[PDB]
Amino acid sequence: VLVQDLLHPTAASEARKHKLKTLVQGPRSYFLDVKCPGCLNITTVFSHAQTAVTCESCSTILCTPTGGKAKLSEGTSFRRK
Amino acid sequence: MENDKGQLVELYVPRKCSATNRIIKADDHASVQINVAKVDEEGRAIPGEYVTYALSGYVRSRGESDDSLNRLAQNDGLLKNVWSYSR
Amino acid sequence: MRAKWRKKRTRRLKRKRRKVRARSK
Amino acid sequence: SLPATFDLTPEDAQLLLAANTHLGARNVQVHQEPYVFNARPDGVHVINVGKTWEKLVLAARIIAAIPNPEDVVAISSRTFGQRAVLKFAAHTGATPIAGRFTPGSFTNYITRSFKEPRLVIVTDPRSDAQAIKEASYVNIPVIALTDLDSPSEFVDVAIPCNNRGKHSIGLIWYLLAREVLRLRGALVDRTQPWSIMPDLYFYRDP
Amino acid sequence: GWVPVTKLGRLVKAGKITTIEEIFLHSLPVKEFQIIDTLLPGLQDEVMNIKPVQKQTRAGQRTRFKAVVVVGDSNGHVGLGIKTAKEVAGAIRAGIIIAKLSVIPIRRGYWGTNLGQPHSLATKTTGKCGSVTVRLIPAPRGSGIVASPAVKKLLQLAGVEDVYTQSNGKTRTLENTLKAAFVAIGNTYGFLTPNLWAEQPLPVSPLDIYSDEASAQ
Amino acid sequence: GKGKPRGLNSARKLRVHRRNNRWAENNYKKRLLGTAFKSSPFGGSSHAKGIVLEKLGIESKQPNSAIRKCVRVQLIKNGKKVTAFVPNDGCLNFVD
Amino acid sequence: PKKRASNGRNKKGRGHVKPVRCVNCSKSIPKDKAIKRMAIRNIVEAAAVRDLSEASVYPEYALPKTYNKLHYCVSCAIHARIVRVRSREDRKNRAPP
Amino acid sequence: GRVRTKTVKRASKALIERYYPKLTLDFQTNKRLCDEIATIQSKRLRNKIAGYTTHLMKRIQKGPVRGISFKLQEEERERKDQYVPEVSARSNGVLNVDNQTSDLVKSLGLKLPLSVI
Amino acid sequence: TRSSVLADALNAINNAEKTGKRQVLIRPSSKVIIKFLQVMQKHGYIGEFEYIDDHRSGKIVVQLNGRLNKCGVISPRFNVKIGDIEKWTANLLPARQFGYVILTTSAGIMDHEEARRKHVSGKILGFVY
RNA sequence: AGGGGAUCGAAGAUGAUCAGAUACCGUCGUAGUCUUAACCAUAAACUAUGCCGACUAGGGAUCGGGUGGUGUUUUUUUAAUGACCCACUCGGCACCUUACGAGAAAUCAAAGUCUUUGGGUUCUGGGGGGAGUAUGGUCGCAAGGCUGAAACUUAAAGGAAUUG
Numbered sequence A: 001v002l003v004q005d006l007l008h009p010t011a012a013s014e015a016r017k018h019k020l021k022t023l024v025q026g027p028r029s030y031f032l033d034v035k036c037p038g039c040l041n042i043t044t045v046f047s048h049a050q051t052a053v054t055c056e057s058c059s060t061i062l063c064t065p066t067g068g069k070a071k072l073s074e075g076t077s078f079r080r081k
Numbered sequence B: 001m002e003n004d005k006g007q008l009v010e011l012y013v014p015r016k017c018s019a020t021n022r023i024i025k026a027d028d029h030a031s032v033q034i035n036v037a038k039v040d041e042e043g044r045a046i047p048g049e050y051v052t053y054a055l056s057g058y059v060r061s062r063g064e065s066d067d068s069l070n071r072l073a074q075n076d077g078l079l080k081n082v083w084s085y086s087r
Numbered sequence C: 001m002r003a004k005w006r007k008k009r010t011r012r013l014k015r016k017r018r019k020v021r022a023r024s025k
Numbered sequence D: 001s002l003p004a005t006f007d008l009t010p011e012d013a014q015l016l017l018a019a020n021t022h023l024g025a026r027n028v029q030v031h032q033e034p035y036v037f038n039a040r041p042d043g044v045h046v047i048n049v050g051k052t053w054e055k056l057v058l059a060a061r062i063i064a065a066i067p068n069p070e071d072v073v074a075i076s077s078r079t080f081g082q083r084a085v086l087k088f089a090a091h092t093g094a095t096p097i098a099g100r101f102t103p104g105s106f107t108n109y110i111t112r113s114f115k116e117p118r119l120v121i122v123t124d125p126r127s128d129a130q131a132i133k134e135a136s137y138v139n140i141p142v143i144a145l146t147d148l149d150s151p152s153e154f155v156d157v158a159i160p161c162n163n164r165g166k167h168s169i170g171l172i173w174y175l176l177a178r179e180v181l182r183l184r185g186a187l188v189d190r191t192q193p194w195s196i197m198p199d200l201y202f203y204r205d206p
Numbered sequence E: 001g002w003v004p005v006t007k008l009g010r011l012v013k014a015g016k017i018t019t020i021e022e023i024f025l026h027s028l029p030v031k032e033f034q035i036i037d038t039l040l041p042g043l044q045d046e047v048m049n050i051k052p053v054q055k056q057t058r059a060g061q062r063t064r065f066k067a068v069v070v071v072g073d074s075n076g077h078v079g080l081g082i083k084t085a086k087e088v089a090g091a092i093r094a095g096i097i098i099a100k101l102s103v104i105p106i107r108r109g110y111w112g113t114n115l116g117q118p119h120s121l122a123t124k125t126t127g128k129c130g131s132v133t134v135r136l137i138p139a140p141r142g143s144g145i146v147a148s149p150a151v152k153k154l155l156q157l158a159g160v161e162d163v164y165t166q167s168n169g170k171t172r173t174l175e176n177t178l179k180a181a182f183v184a185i186g187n188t189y190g191f192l193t194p195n196l197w198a199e200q201p202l203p204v205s206p207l208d209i210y211s212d213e214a215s216a217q
Numbered sequence F: 001g002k003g004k005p006r007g008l009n010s011a012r013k014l015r016v017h018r019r020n021n022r023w024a025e026n027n028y029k030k031r032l033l034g035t036a037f038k039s040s041p042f043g044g045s046s047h048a049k050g051i052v053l054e055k056l057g058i059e060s061k062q063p064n065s066a067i068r069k070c071v072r073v074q075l076i077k078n079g080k081k082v083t084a085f086v087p088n089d090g091c092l093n094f095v096d
Numbered sequence G: 001p002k003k004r005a006s007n008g009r010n011k012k013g014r015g016h017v018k019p020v021r022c023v024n025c026s027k028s029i030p031k032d033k034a035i036k037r038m039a040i041r042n043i044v045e046a047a048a049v050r051d052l053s054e055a056s057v058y059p060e061y062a063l064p065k066t067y068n069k070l071h072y073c074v075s076c077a078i079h080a081r082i083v084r085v086r087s088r089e090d091r092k093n094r095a096p097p
Numbered sequence H: 001g002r003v004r005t006k007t008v009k010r011a012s013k014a015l016i017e018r019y020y021p022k023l024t025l026d027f028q029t030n031k032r033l034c035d036e037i038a039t040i041q042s043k044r045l046r047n048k049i050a051g052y053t054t055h056l057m058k059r060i061q062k063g064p065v066r067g068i069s070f071k072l073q074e075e076e077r078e079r080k081d082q083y084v085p086e087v088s089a090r091s092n093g094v095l096n097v098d099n100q101t102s103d104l105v106k107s108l109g110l111k112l113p114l115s116v117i
Numbered sequence I: 001t002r003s004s005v006l007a008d009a010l011n012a013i014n015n016a017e018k019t020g021k022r023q024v025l026i027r028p029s030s031k032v033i034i035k036f037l038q039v040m041q042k043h044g045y046i047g048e049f050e051y052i053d054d055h056r057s058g059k060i061v062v063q064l065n066g067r068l069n070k071c072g073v074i075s076p077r078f079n080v081k082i083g084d085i086e087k088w089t090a091n092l093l094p095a096r097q098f099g100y101v102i103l104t105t106s107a108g109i110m111d112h113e114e115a116r117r118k119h120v121s122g123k124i125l126g127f128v129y
Numbered sequence J: 001a002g003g004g005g006a007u008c009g010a011a012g013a014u015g016a017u018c019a020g021a022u023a024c025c026g027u028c029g030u031a032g033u034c035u036u037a038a039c040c041a042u043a044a045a046c047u048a049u050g051c052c053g054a055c056u057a058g059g060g061a062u063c064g065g066g067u068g069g070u071g072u073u074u075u076u077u078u079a080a081u082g083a084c085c086c087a088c089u090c091g092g093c094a095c096c097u098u099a100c101g102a103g104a105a106a107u108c109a110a111a112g113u114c115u116u117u118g119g120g121u122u123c124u125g126g127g128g129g130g131a132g133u134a135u136g137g138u139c140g141c142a143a144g145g146c147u148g149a150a151a152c153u154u155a156a157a158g159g160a161a162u163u164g
Ligand SMILES: NC[C@@H]1O[C@H](O[C@H]2[C@@H](O)[C@H](O[C@@H]3[C@@H](O)[C@H](N)C[C@H](N)[C@H]3O[C@H]3O[C@H](CO)[C@@H](O)[C@H](O)[C@H]3N)O[C@@H]2CO)[C@H](N)[C@@H](O)[C@@H]1O
Pocket: J060, J062, J063
């Protein structure tokens, strides 16, 4: 810790750092793609859900909002892109 | 330090720190100079022939000495796979 | 004398000084 | 640049891992963070022993380089390998200091302890920090055996190890003396192991 | 002749180092008062001040004397020391001993023009003994030493020809004023100008060149 | 920091605030209040003629003892009575 | 000049602590100040415990304890040497004896 | 009480240093010894110097004593500090590590004799 | 609130290089930082610097070579006559030999000597030595 | 001003105490203490330390929030909301070590980045007294608050630390 690389820092330390504290502030949030217990229709849901999102018809509960990433319900799928 | 006609006028020219490039003064007795020994084939270092480094009172005190050598050593070549340039 | 009690002492002085001046109506 | 053969000589590797010099401290002290490989759970942070070896290499070569072997000071007050500094010191010029340091030894030209070395080496930079202070008074460079938890102040190039007792300390001085006797000296045959026992450098009993 | 007890005293008494600038350059802790005697003959000492100080015994008091001396030549090697002792001339004596163990290099300089043997300092410098800052400014030639007579003497033996000064603090405390100005000139060579930007090999430290004749006999 | 405005437009806040604090300077105060022309026995002049009322010996302060031989004088231009010391040795005999 | 950086004892980011009454002087003193040493005693002590356990019914029984937390102001606590004077760096140590 | 002052101790301490082989556990002989190799202005002073330096002896014949060293002690010092084991690293065939320090082997480009747990 | 943005920079530069570090992270990045950083680097007192693009005002990374005593700023940025550059240069510069008072003229950022040859002038900015 | 009035308790009354004892200590006790409505606007109202922004150093405890723990524990998926452990990261009340620095020192992660003197901005101070007095104004029912001089006097006053 005298001379180091600020231009090319390791992502080992940079990914445990703060969202604003990376060399360029990144979003730490992602986007799912989800279905029902019984339905194929794919909802595009945000990783941290302030709203309680529904899958459209038959008025389901996909996720209950938290102080953070939404808490999903029982079982259903997810894909991070 | 030159002079009028180009005739050097000065009493002495001090030594930059190898780590900080900062002058080492006369009362700088905190400072340290390091002698690393050149070798022939299969070791057995040559007397009179050294690789030399200078670490002033500051860097030694502030705690970058061991690290500022590994920093320095690899470049002229001493060691490999020791000091990272990134944390 | 105590700081505090010098205060009380002149706070009495200013009362008497107001009163004597009052007699000038 | 160093010839290939000076590489860690894998037979020596398991001698290290037998002496447990790979077992670091339970706290890091960020100047020692480049000297760690990873942290085993249940408390140990493993030292890279190749960086360790490359230090003994660099340590030696500087110990070697010092023109006169007699003033190169090897200091230990620690009964956990104070002994090794007598063994190291006979195998080189190396005037040892083993036991209490008697402060004012490098300063204070009167005292019976006076010295003016061009190099100083220390087992434990904490309990030997007395002399480390006096180092920077007289300009003397310094080598040390530094655990992960151990002070980084005023020590020049220094060697990581366990120094929680016994082997690692002696194992390094034994390795140090061996390596400084190999470098220049009379050992040669660098591939050839030493007859001398590493446990000769181990403090004993009762 | 003296009886050198230290590793440097050998290389001195032998005749193997003829200038202090070597002892300076490698930052060598001169421990022997006679070392700098040889290297610098005719090094002029002036006694600045003598004053008594008073402690108490298990009842009454204690009396002894503080001595303030400056040793320099004209060429930029200067020292300053304070010794306090029982006798007076003993304090003066041992004062000059400590004054010599302190002597220090000086980076001199020109004003606007490099003609003819630098008359001034390199940059502006300052140094502070507690509460007292003495600050040195590069005057031109013919200006002389602008400073209080107490410092002017130090800057004389410092080998300063022309200089400017500014002081902030308790100046009537003399022992702190000279120590302040002593930090000042004793800085200029630590001030890195573009002259000294020039890269250098790290000259080889005669301590190990003469290592033979050095170590104890 | 520095607690005082450096802004390029701040001249008046500076020019004023100094004009305000100058009042703390004793010498400056006296000049504006006209202290000498009012509160001083001399008019603010360097000398005053006056006439002696009574010869006055005055005891000295600690740690001294002697009689200081002064006089009471009534300034002509003024009328203000003032006490002045008569110096040297036995010059009190010179004034009546 | 400041003697302590707790100044008398620890507040550090509040405006008040409702003061407590001394168990000796009755002197008032903030709860954040005011030396408090919890004191539990044997209900019996002395050699009483022997002939008391003798004189009692119940098999072997068990012994209750009095529970009191005494609060002390400085002036009293020092006089009664619940606490004593220490040196410049001795005062520093907060470790309980 | 019976405490002996420094002139005594600082003598007896320096006697055993340079005279150890010629010194004994017998006081009365060391008394006669003290009159030869040393000079002591008064008789009574000598007996105390002898009396402690034999007490200093009977402890140095019972074990190493802190304040002083000498020839014969520093000799068996070098002698008695020798002993090596027959073999000690032996070790029992491979070497025992727990998984991680072993990765360092698979890191540095080495093999060794690997036993994990 | 952050009011200079340049002085916030030259401080971070001046700070670390006086603690021995070789590299410094500046943010945000003024084009006036850049022009200053230029005259610094071209006169040697610093190393080479690499602009960094956020979608924000952007960062910088400056390599420190040592050898730099002080980089600084004059706020407020005074109006300076031409004859009055001499009385500035004598003030904050270490010696008449070297050192740089850096202004901002209508011709743009430069040092005091570069100003002298062109015979221009403007508001003051900072200093380098 | 009503309501209230348990306790404690100015004034006071006493008993003791002392050469005296208008007190400290003891018994009683008015206002007060509590409340409602309305004033008052002072406290060592203290961290005796302005606010905003940046920068420079290590260390463990802890409060709140978030992220990762195919870590842990209690039930009857030993899976599920919890609590616990561990690592990371903001934001807190503090604390420790070092002095990188700073200071007259005591000390200070700011009280640093200050004669290499300027990021922005608000307030105050200019020897000790006299004196927070006099006067005017203003606010208050009043006690008082806010504002706030001068004449004159004086060589010290003061801070920190040291030895006694
Ligand atoms: N602003 C808090 C910061 O916490 C930082 O990190 C601290 C903690 O956040 C971090 O977590 C520690 C953990 O290391 C340690 N081994 C156990 C400890 N319980 C943890 O702390 C955690 O649990 C405690 C309650 O137990 C909570 O109060 C705390 O918020 C939480 N972070 O460990 C650090 C303490 O050793 C730094 N100390 C420092 O930047 C600063 O103090």
